[PDB]
Coordinates of C-alpha atoms in Angstrom, one line a residue:
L1 CA 0.0 0.0 0.0
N2 CA 1.2 3.5 -0.9
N3 CA 1.3 5.9 2.1
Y4 CA 2.6 8.7 -0.1
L5 CA -0.5 8.8 -2.4
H6 CA -3.5 10.8 -1.2
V7 CA -7.0 11.1 -2.6
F8 CA -9.5 13.9 -1.9
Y9 CA -12.6 12.3 -0.3
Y10 CA -16.1 13.8 0.2
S11 CA -18.6 12.6 2.8
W12 CA -21.4 15.1 2.1
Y13 CA -23.9 12.9 0.1
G14 CA -27.2 12.0 1.6
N15 CA -30.3 10.0 0.6
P16 CA -33.8 9.4 2.1
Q17 CA -33.0 5.9 3.3
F18 CA -30.1 7.0 5.6
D19 CA -30.7 10.7 6.0
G20 CA -34.4 11.2 5.4
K21 CA -33.8 13.7 2.5
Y22 CA -31.5 13.9 -0.4
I23 CA -28.3 15.9 0.2
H24 CA -26.0 17.1 -2.6
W25 CA -27.4 14.7 -5.2
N26 CA -30.2 17.2 -5.4
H27 CA -28.1 20.2 -6.4
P28 CA -29.3 23.6 -7.5
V29 CA -28.4 24.5 -11.1
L30 CA -26.8 27.9 -10.2
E31 CA -28.2 30.8 -12.3
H32 CA -26.0 32.8 -14.6
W33 CA -25.6 36.5 -13.5
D34 CA -26.8 37.9 -16.9
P35 CA -30.6 37.3 -17.5
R36 CA -30.0 37.1 -21.3
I37 CA -27.8 34.0 -20.8
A38 CA -29.7 32.5 -17.8
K39 CA -33.0 32.5 -19.8
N40 CA -31.5 29.7 -21.9
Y41 CA -30.1 27.4 -19.2
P42 CA -31.9 24.8 -16.9
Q43 CA -33.0 26.1 -13.5
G44 CA -34.1 24.5 -10.2
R45 CA -32.9 21.4 -8.3
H46 CA -32.0 18.0 -9.7
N47 CA -34.6 15.3 -8.7
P48 CA -32.7 12.1 -7.6
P49 CA -32.3 9.2 -7.8
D50 CA -32.6 9.3 -11.6
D51 CA -31.7 12.9 -12.2
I52 CA -28.5 13.8 -10.2
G53 CA -26.2 16.8 -10.2
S54 CA -23.3 15.0 -12.0
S55 CA -22.3 14.3 -15.6
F56 CA -21.4 10.8 -14.4
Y57 CA -23.5 8.2 -12.5
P58 CA -22.1 6.2 -9.6
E59 CA -22.1 2.4 -9.5
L60 CA -23.5 2.7 -5.9
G61 CA -26.2 5.0 -7.3
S62 CA -27.3 8.2 -5.5
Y63 CA -25.7 7.0 -2.3
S64 CA -25.6 8.1 1.3
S65 CA -22.1 8.9 2.7
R66 CA -23.3 7.7 6.1
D67 CA -24.4 4.2 4.8
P68 CA -21.7 1.9 6.4
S69 CA -21.7 -0.4 3.3
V70 CA -21.0 2.6 1.1
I71 CA -18.0 3.7 3.2
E72 CA -16.8 0.1 3.1
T73 CA -17.2 -0.1 -0.7
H74 CA -15.3 3.2 -1.0
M75 CA -12.5 1.9 1.2
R76 CA -12.2 -1.3 -0.9
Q77 CA -12.1 0.8 -4.1
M78 CA -9.2 2.9 -2.8
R79 CA -7.4 -0.2 -1.5
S80 CA -7.7 -1.6 -5.1
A81 CA -6.1 1.6 -6.5
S82 CA -3.2 1.4 -4.0
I83 CA -4.2 4.6 -2.3
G84 CA -3.1 4.6 1.3
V85 CA -4.5 7.9 2.6
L86 CA -7.8 9.7 2.1
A87 CA -7.8 13.4 2.5
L88 CA -11.2 14.1 4.0
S89 CA -13.1 17.3 3.2
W90 CA -13.8 18.8 6.6
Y91 CA -15.9 21.6 8.1
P92 CA -16.0 22.4 11.8
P93 CA -18.8 21.0 14.1
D94 CA -22.2 22.1 13.0
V95 CA -20.9 24.0 10.0
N96 CA -21.3 22.8 6.4
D97 CA -20.9 23.9 2.8
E98 CA -23.8 25.9 1.2
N99 CA -25.5 22.8 -0.4
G100 CA -24.8 20.3 2.4
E101 CA -25.2 19.3 6.0
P102 CA -22.5 19.1 8.7
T103 CA -20.1 16.2 8.2
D104 CA -18.0 16.2 11.4
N105 CA -20.3 13.5 12.8
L106 CA -19.2 11.0 10.2
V107 CA -15.5 11.3 11.0
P108 CA -15.6 8.7 13.9
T109 CA -17.5 6.3 11.6
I110 CA -15.2 7.0 8.6
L111 CA -12.0 6.4 10.6
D112 CA -13.3 3.0 11.9
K113 CA -14.0 1.8 8.3
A114 CA -10.6 3.2 7.1
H115 CA -8.7 1.3 9.8
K116 CA -10.7 -1.8 9.1
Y117 CA -9.1 -1.8 5.6
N118 CA -5.6 -0.4 6.6
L119 CA -6.2 3.1 5.2
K120 CA -5.2 6.4 6.9
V121 CA -7.3 9.6 7.1
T122 CA -6.0 13.1 6.9
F123 CA -7.8 16.4 6.9
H124 CA -8.7 18.8 4.1
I125 CA -9.8 22.0 5.9
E126 CA -12.4 23.8 3.8
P127 CA -12.9 27.6 3.7
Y128 CA -15.7 27.7 6.3
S129 CA -16.9 31.2 7.0
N130 CA -14.7 33.6 9.0
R131 CA -11.8 31.2 9.1
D132 CA -8.8 32.9 10.6
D133 CA -5.8 32.0 12.8
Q134 CA -7.9 31.9 16.0
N135 CA -10.5 29.3 15.1
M136 CA -7.9 27.5 13.0
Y137 CA -6.1 27.1 16.3
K138 CA -9.3 25.8 17.9
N139 CA -10.1 23.5 15.1
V140 CA -6.6 22.0 14.8
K141 CA -6.9 21.4 18.5
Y142 CA -10.3 19.8 18.0
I143 CA -9.1 17.4 15.3
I144 CA -5.9 16.3 17.1
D145 CA -7.9 15.8 20.4
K146 CA -10.9 13.9 19.1
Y147 CA -9.3 11.9 16.3
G148 CA -5.5 12.1 17.0
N149 CA -5.5 8.8 19.0
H150 CA -7.4 6.8 16.5
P151 CA -5.3 4.1 14.8
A152 CA -6.4 5.2 11.3
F153 CA -5.3 8.9 11.9
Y154 CA -2.7 9.9 9.4
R155 CA 0.8 11.1 10.3
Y156 CA 3.6 11.8 7.8
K157 CA 7.2 10.7 8.9
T158 CA 9.5 13.7 8.3
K159 CA 13.2 13.7 7.4
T160 CA 13.8 14.4 11.2
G161 CA 12.1 11.1 12.1
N162 CA 9.1 12.9 13.8
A163 CA 5.6 11.7 12.6
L164 CA 3.1 14.6 12.4
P165 CA -0.5 15.3 11.4
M166 CA -1.1 16.7 8.0
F167 CA -3.6 19.5 7.1
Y168 CA -4.4 20.5 3.5
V169 CA -5.8 24.1 3.8
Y170 CA -8.1 25.0 0.8
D171 CA -8.0 28.6 -0.3
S172 CA -5.3 29.4 2.3
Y173 CA -4.5 32.8 0.7
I174 CA -7.9 34.1 1.9
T175 CA -6.2 34.8 5.3
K176 CA -3.3 37.3 5.3
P177 CA 0.2 35.8 5.6
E178 CA 0.9 37.7 8.9
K179 CA -2.2 36.2 10.5
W180 CA -1.1 32.7 9.5
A181 CA 2.3 33.6 11.0
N182 CA 0.6 33.7 14.4
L183 CA -0.3 30.0 14.0
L184 CA 2.4 28.6 11.9
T185 CA 5.8 30.1 12.9
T186 CA 7.7 29.4 16.2
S187 CA 7.5 33.0 17.5
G188 CA 3.8 33.4 16.6
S189 CA 1.1 34.7 19.1
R190 CA -0.9 31.4 19.1
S191 CA 1.9 29.1 17.6
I192 CA 1.2 25.4 17.3
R193 CA 4.9 24.7 17.0
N194 CA 6.5 22.3 19.5
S195 CA 3.2 21.7 21.1
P196 CA 1.0 18.6 21.0
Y197 CA -1.0 20.3 18.2
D198 CA 1.9 20.5 15.8
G199 CA 1.5 19.4 12.1
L200 CA 2.5 19.8 8.5
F201 CA 0.2 22.4 7.0
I202 CA -0.1 22.4 3.3
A203 CA -1.2 25.7 1.6
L204 CA -3.1 25.9 -1.7
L205 CA -1.1 27.7 -4.4
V206 CA -3.3 29.3 -7.1
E207 CA -1.0 32.1 -8.4
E208 CA 2.7 32.7 -8.7
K209 CA 2.7 35.6 -6.2
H210 CA 1.6 33.0 -3.5
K211 CA 5.0 31.4 -3.4
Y212 CA 6.1 34.3 -1.2
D213 CA 2.8 34.5 0.7
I214 CA 3.3 30.9 1.7
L215 CA 7.0 31.3 2.7
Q216 CA 6.1 34.2 5.1
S217 CA 3.2 32.3 6.6
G218 CA 5.0 29.3 8.0
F219 CA 3.3 26.6 5.9
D220 CA 5.2 23.3 5.5
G221 CA 4.2 22.7 1.9
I222 CA 2.1 23.6 -1.2
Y223 CA -0.6 21.8 -3.1
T224 CA -2.3 22.6 -6.4
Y225 CA -5.8 21.0 -6.1
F226 CA -7.4 21.7 -9.4
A227 CA -8.0 18.8 -11.9
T228 CA -8.2 21.1 -14.9
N229 CA -4.7 21.4 -16.4
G230 CA -4.0 25.1 -16.8
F231 CA -6.9 26.5 -14.9
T232 CA -4.6 28.4 -12.5
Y233 CA -0.8 29.0 -12.4
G234 CA -0.6 26.1 -9.8
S235 CA -2.8 23.6 -11.8
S236 CA -0.8 24.2 -15.0
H237 CA 1.4 21.0 -15.3
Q238 CA 4.2 23.0 -17.1
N239 CA 4.7 25.2 -14.0
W240 CA 5.4 22.2 -11.8
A241 CA 9.1 21.7 -12.7
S242 CA 9.4 25.4 -11.6
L243 CA 7.5 24.9 -8.3
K244 CA 9.4 21.8 -7.3
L245 CA 12.7 23.7 -7.6
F246 CA 11.2 26.5 -5.4
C247 CA 10.0 24.1 -2.7
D248 CA 13.3 22.2 -2.5
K249 CA 15.1 25.6 -2.2
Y250 CA 13.0 26.6 0.9
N251 CA 12.4 23.1 2.5
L252 CA 8.7 22.9 1.5
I253 CA 6.8 19.7 0.7
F254 CA 5.5 19.9 -2.9
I255 CA 2.3 17.9 -3.4
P256 CA 1.0 18.0 -7.0
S257 CA -2.7 17.3 -7.6
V258 CA -3.8 15.2 -10.6
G259 CA -7.3 14.6 -11.9
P260 CA -9.0 12.2 -14.4
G261 CA -10.8 15.1 -16.1
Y262 CA -13.3 17.9 -15.4
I263 CA -17.0 18.5 -16.3
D264 CA -19.4 20.4 -14.1
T265 CA -22.0 21.4 -16.7
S266 CA -24.8 19.6 -14.9
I267 CA -24.7 22.4 -12.2
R268 CA -23.0 25.2 -14.2
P269 CA -24.4 24.8 -17.7
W270 CA -22.5 27.7 -19.3
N271 CA -19.1 26.5 -18.1
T272 CA -18.3 24.2 -21.1
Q273 CA -15.1 26.1 -21.5
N274 CA -13.6 24.3 -18.4
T275 CA -14.7 20.8 -19.5
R276 CA -11.7 18.4 -20.1
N277 CA -12.7 15.1 -21.6
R278 CA -11.2 12.0 -20.0
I279 CA -10.3 10.5 -23.4
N280 CA -10.5 7.1 -21.9
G281 CA -8.0 7.8 -19.1
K282 CA -5.3 9.3 -21.3
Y283 CA -5.8 12.8 -19.6
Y284 CA -5.5 11.2 -16.2
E285 CA -2.3 9.3 -17.2
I286 CA -0.6 12.4 -18.8
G287 CA -1.4 14.1 -15.4
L288 CA 0.1 11.3 -13.3
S289 CA 3.2 11.2 -15.6
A290 CA 3.8 15.0 -15.2
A291 CA 3.4 14.6 -11.5
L292 CA 5.9 11.7 -11.2
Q293 CA 8.5 13.6 -13.2
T294 CA 8.8 16.2 -10.5
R295 CA 10.1 13.4 -8.2
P296 CA 7.7 14.6 -5.4
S297 CA 7.5 13.6 -1.7
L298 CA 3.7 13.1 -1.9
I299 CA 1.1 13.0 -4.8
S300 CA -2.6 14.0 -4.4
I301 CA -5.6 12.9 -6.6
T302 CA -8.6 15.2 -7.3
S303 CA -10.8 13.5 -6.5
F304 CA -12.2 10.3 -5.2
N305 CA -15.8 11.4 -5.4
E306 CA -16.4 15.0 -6.4
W307 CA -19.3 14.0 -8.6
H308 CA -20.5 17.5 -9.2
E309 CA -17.2 18.6 -10.8
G310 CA -16.7 15.3 -12.7
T311 CA -13.3 14.7 -11.2
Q312 CA -14.1 11.4 -9.5
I313 CA -12.1 8.2 -9.8
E314 CA -14.9 6.2 -8.0
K315 CA -16.7 3.5 -9.9
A316 CA -19.2 4.8 -12.5
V317 CA -21.8 2.8 -14.5
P318 CA -23.6 3.8 -17.9
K319 CA -26.9 5.4 -17.3
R320 CA -29.7 6.8 -19.4
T321 CA -33.0 8.3 -18.3
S322 CA -36.1 10.0 -20.0
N323 CA -33.9 13.0 -21.0
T324 CA -30.3 12.4 -19.9
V325 CA -27.5 10.3 -21.2
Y326 CA -24.8 10.2 -18.5
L327 CA -21.1 10.0 -19.4
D328 CA -19.5 6.7 -18.5
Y329 CA -16.1 4.9 -18.6
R330 CA -17.0 2.8 -21.7
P331 CA -15.4 1.1 -23.6
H332 CA -13.7 0.2 -20.3
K333 CA -15.1 -1.2 -17.0
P334 CA -16.5 0.8 -14.1
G335 CA -13.2 0.4 -12.3
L336 CA -10.9 2.0 -15.0
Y337 CA -9.7 4.9 -13.0
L338 CA -9.0 2.7 -9.9
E339 CA -7.1 0.3 -12.2
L340 CA -5.1 3.2 -13.7
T341 CA -4.3 4.7 -10.3
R342 CA -2.9 1.3 -9.2
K343 CA -0.5 1.1 -12.1
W344 CA 0.8 4.6 -11.5
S345 CA 0.8 4.2 -7.7
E346 CA 3.1 1.2 -8.1
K347 CA 5.4 3.0 -10.5
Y348 CA 5.6 5.9 -8.1
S349 CA 6.2 3.7 -5.0
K350 CA 9.1 1.9 -6.7
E351 CA 10.7 5.2 -8.0
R352 CA 10.1 7.1 -4.7
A353 CA 12.4 4.5 -3.0
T354 CA 15.3 6.2 -4.7
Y355 CA 14.8 9.8 -3.4
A356 CA 12.9 9.0 -0.1

């Protein structure tokens, strides 16, 4: 199993059988700002189980994230792809994304199923409202306290030989660098350094200018997130060679993010310009290759199951309804992207042995 390969996991899906209502599968269609353009595009909410807010359709159907057999199936799928760590999208207690319900309750149940299958869980801290250094302190404390002692809880073994919690921080540039300094540098106001709530904090790099923002802040590494090649400076594959060199120069952990494709037109119908076709896994493989060539300490995959954005590697079946033809993995099997991940996971693990 590959402890140096991470996948972004989402636990925000609900259905009537396990939740009493659909959550996320019933997604609003997001109206365009200009009435002239919005007139022409679908409006309202998707009506599951047949009509979901995705271009693809899951083998497990419009599933609930809290269904224990679903979590188990997911774990087995990851296992079969040689992914060791799942980076769990996280919001604080009783907070959630705008189309979801709080998901911190699932964490104990997710950890259990992860350990059952010898997987590790790390945390992907979402931009919850009024996130700053203070409540970031509180929430890092929360995570390490509640979940730190669980056997599935992920720690990365440093060069020093000290195993530390990892935190991926999405949209980290929202908070000013000098506020992050309070949390992330040794002399900071509310510094987590050399305390029991220490960790490797990974900042999201969108733009070139952020290199210096991140340096100031005290972050331990950078990650690119976006599946779309060339959507941002960071998600452009060509800029990776450059970013690796920068991270090695200032002792940062560079974690590139690779995706199978992108299509979110089921919930943003104008946004065809950002669609990247999977071209039967060739786009995913060109991604992985580019990521491997940087000789990185870790690699991340966007995503396991972001169904809305069409970036999932989870199993997907062909499906057609009264007025939709879902995209599928044909001519290949439902497990294609898991099967491809495995091949590249193994190549990576054998190569990584020679730069450790």
